Design a protein around this ligand. Sequence first.
Ligand code: VFJ
Ligand code: VFJ
Ligand code: ZN
Length: 257
Amino acid sequence: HWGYGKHNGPEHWHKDFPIAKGERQSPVDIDTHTAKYDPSLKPLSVSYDQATSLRILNNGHAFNVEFDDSQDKAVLKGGPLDGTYRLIQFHFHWGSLDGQGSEHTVDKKKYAAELHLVHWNTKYGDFGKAVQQPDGLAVLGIFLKVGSAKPGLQKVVDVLDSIKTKGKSADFTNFDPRGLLPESLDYWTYPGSLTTPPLLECVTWIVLKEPISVSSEQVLKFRKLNFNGEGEPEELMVDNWRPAQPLKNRQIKASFK
Ligand SMILES: CCCC(=O)Nc1nnc(S(N)(=O)=O)s1
Ligand SMILES: CCCC(=O)Nc1nnc(S(N)(=O)=O)s1
Ligand SMILES: [Zn+2]
């Protein structure tokens, strides 16, 4: 089964998921000088005030904080998006070292980690139908650098002990994802894919320019998670990031001058 190891990592995924070599794969390097300001892009609308988190799950590849997406409670709209996209989960990708971990890069710079807030287009009714559509998902990507702690991340950090191994979940209610955003909502945007199998080409990527700062202790706790299940040989959940893929026939647009 696919993963991030030497024998099942990103260079192997194409054998089971041939779209891995497709025309709109993610992540990509964001070349800041080549991205073009698009004054027709509207400001992002992040409406998370009514978000209902439910559960946190170690799925053997990352951990997902899952939300109640049965109503329009936490939605993303505006920016490059047409219509309303409902938050379903967020998760991170991170490195074994502070010098790596993000999936998107900025002028080839890798951040220590990257947060993905995953939303599905409500016109498709459910996430499973949305992923079959070229505009089915909107993923808001936020870079993490190591520095000062992120207070709003700490509740996530502190529950990770309870979901150390693949398949473990824990109740995770009343978590406010607004505590994970940076101050500015300036963004780059381009059409892409899921960055994990099945790598479906269904994502409008919105990547914020401003990273958030997390502490070394916070990211160290991410790195204590396990890819393996309980009772299996311990393999630290680190470096669960796919590297940048060819941009091909795509233009990255910037929301800011
Ligand atoms: C020794 C590990 C065995 C293994 O994992 N082999 C794979 N070959 N292709 C894979 S996938 N789902 O990424 O395409 S996994
Ligand atoms: C329960 C939602 C299923 C889901 O979100 N699947 C994803 N697979 N790759 C993603 S990424 N790294 O592109 O945001 S999201
Ligand atoms: Zn992701």
